[PDB]
Amino acid sequence: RLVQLSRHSIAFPSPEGALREPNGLLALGGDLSPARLLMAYQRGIFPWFSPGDPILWWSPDPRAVLWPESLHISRSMKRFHKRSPYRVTMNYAFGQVIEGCASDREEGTWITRGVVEAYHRLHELGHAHSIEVWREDELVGGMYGVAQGTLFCGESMFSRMENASKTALLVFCEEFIGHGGKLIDCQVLNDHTASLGACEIPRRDYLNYLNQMRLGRLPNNFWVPRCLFSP
Amino acid sequence: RLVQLSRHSIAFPSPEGALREPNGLLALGGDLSPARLLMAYQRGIFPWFSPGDPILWWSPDPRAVLWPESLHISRSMKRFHKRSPYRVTMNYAFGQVIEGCASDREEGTWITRGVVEAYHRLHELGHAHSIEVWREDELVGGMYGVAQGTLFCGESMFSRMENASKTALLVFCEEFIGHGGKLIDCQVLNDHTASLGACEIPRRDYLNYLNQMRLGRLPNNFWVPRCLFSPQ
Numbered sequence: 110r111l112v113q114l115s116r117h118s119i120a121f122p123s124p125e126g127a128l129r130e131p132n133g134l135l136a137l138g139g140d141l142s143p144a145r146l147l148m149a150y151q152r153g154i155f156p157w158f159s160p161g162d163p164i165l166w167w168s169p170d171p172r173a174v175l176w177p178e179s180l181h182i183s184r185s186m187k188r189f190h191k192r193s194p195y196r197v198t199m200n201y202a203f204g205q206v207i208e209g210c211a212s213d214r215e216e217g218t219w220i221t222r223g224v225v226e227a228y229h230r231l232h233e234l235g236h237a238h239s240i241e242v243w244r245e246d247e248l249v250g251g252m253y254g255v256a257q258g259t260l261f262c263g264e265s266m267f268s269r270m271e272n273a274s275k276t277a278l279l280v281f282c283e284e285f286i287g288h289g290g291k292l293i294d295c296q297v298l299n300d301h302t303a304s305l306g307a308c309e310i311p312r313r314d315y316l317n318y319l320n321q322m323r324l325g326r327l328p329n330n331f332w333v334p335r336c337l338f339s340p
Numbered sequence: 341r342l343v344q345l346s347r348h349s350i351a352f353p354s355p356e357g358a359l360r361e362p363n364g365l366l367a368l369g370g371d372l373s374p375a376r377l378l379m380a381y382q383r384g385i386f387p388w389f390s391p392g393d394p395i396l397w398w399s400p401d402p403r404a405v406l407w408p409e410s411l412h413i414s415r416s417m418k419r420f421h422k423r424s425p426y427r428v429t430m431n432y433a434f435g436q437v438i439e440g441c442a443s444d445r446e447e448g449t450w451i452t453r454g455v456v457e458a459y460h461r462l463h464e465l466g467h468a469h470s471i472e473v474w475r476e477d478e479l480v481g482g483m484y485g486v487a488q489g490t491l492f493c494g495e496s497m498f499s500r501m502e503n504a505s506k507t508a509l510l511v512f513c514e515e516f517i518g519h520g521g522k523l524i525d526c527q528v529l530n531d532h533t534a535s536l537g538a539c540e541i542p543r544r545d546y547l548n549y550l551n552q553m554r555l556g557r558l559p560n561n562f563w564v565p566r567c568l569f570s571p572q
């Protein structure tokens with residue numbers, strides 16, 4: 110079933126044809142052009158591969174996801190955030206945020222220069238966005254992802270100061286569900302993500318939700334760079 | 341006559357007071373801030389000036405216009421589109437379409453970094469939209485403009501491959517007609533646009549439509565990013 114793409118076409122096979130093991134392996138090759146990525150996210154597919162490997166495309170089953178309103182903020186964290194030392198912005202510094210996610214040296218190692226450029230382009234073309242957590246004047250955390258209507262595909266988050274991540278995920282969610290936001294894609298469920306409320310659902314249901322929310326919208330100025338949380 | 345705009349205000353003078361030669365010259369100055377720009381379109385005035393010159397605002401008489409249903413499509417173009425090698429999307433890459441137009445060099449030359457940013461702001465705010473034409477993984481054509489209700493002001497189009505721009509306009513028009521679209525402003529008629537079916541009407545006539553149509557309303561999600569036409 111595994112299909113190998115080419116520059117000749119930006120078309121992906123159907124998600125349903127993905128492999129079980131590894132879970133979701135749908136295709137390889139192609140490029141990371143704005144067009145190909147938009148076509149991919151539009152069909153519930155996303156790129157993920159380690160450096161040195163050809164571009165690998167996925168559509169796992171089940172699919173990890175997170176309902177905004179179902180975010181789990183610990184008792185200790187609400188106390189922390191009630192007196193948060195951070196300020197949160199939107200699309201003020203996409204480059205630093207994804208560089209942050211790339212830096213750490215864990216699941217962000219896949220984010221190579223090539224990946225960085227590709228998503229930075231999407232951010233400029235207006236589809237990939239970032240939330241920035243600030244401590245004083247320095248960036249200590251944040252997250253970025255690709256928007257798909259009222260749906261948000263979370264690519265990655267990073268932190269250089271205690272509770273910076275959660276702060277972004279926390280505030281983004283309030284801002285998100287307050288303006289029509291309906292869903293966040295986590296791709297594959299892990300520990301940190303689970304501890305935040307991420308829950309699995311069937312791929313078919315995810316795709317069902319996907320082309321249901323991609324044609325929706327949020328306020329015109331929702332992604333306009335601005336301040337999301339400042340005491 | 342004529343009029344210098346002020347950073348202070350954001351108001352414009354009556355289009356009817358514009359010059360005859362050069363046809364449309366109404367005012368000069370101000371800036372390209374979202375507000376002033378948007379107000380200009382409301383009033384049937386648009387900015388146009390060569391790099392180096394001060395901002396120039398226009399409202400020509402007659403005004404070039406294109407009734408969507410009257411878009412002329414040659415028989416060989418129909419043949420081609422039927423087996424089209426192109427993909428058409430909406431608001432996938434506004435920045436590239438405008439940059440694509442700012443390179444047409446016949447006269448996309450007026451489109452400076454200043455103009456690109458100005459229209460890019462309108463796009464960020466949801467007033468300026470783009471229609472892209474893709475050949476495989478390459479952007480080979482498109483068009484962008486400012487939405488005015490059910491009226492649509494075409495700013496420019498570009499083409500890097502045979503019939504690329506004609507399919508953009510063809511696919512757009514279908515989409516546009518389908519959901520209430522009523523008229524496309526073409527500003528000043530030119531050989532190409534005229535062959536696609538564009539025509540001239542009086543400025544007072546155009547303004548009339550503009551006022552009626554700016555109140556119009558397209559589906560709530562008409563402009564969200566999406567594919568409009570997938571090749572075969």
Ligand SMILES: N[C@@H](Cc1ccccc1)C(=O)O
Nearest residue numbers: 252263264265266295296302
């Ligand atoms: N794959 C990402 C999904 C995600 C990114 C950003 C915000 C929320 C979720 C993760 O595991 O963190």
Ligand SMILES: N[C@@H](Cc1ccccc1)C(=O)O
Nearest residue numbers: 483494495496497526527533
């Ligand atoms: N002023 C434009 C009008 C137009 C642009 C794009 C699409 C349709 C019409 C031109 O002739 O370049």
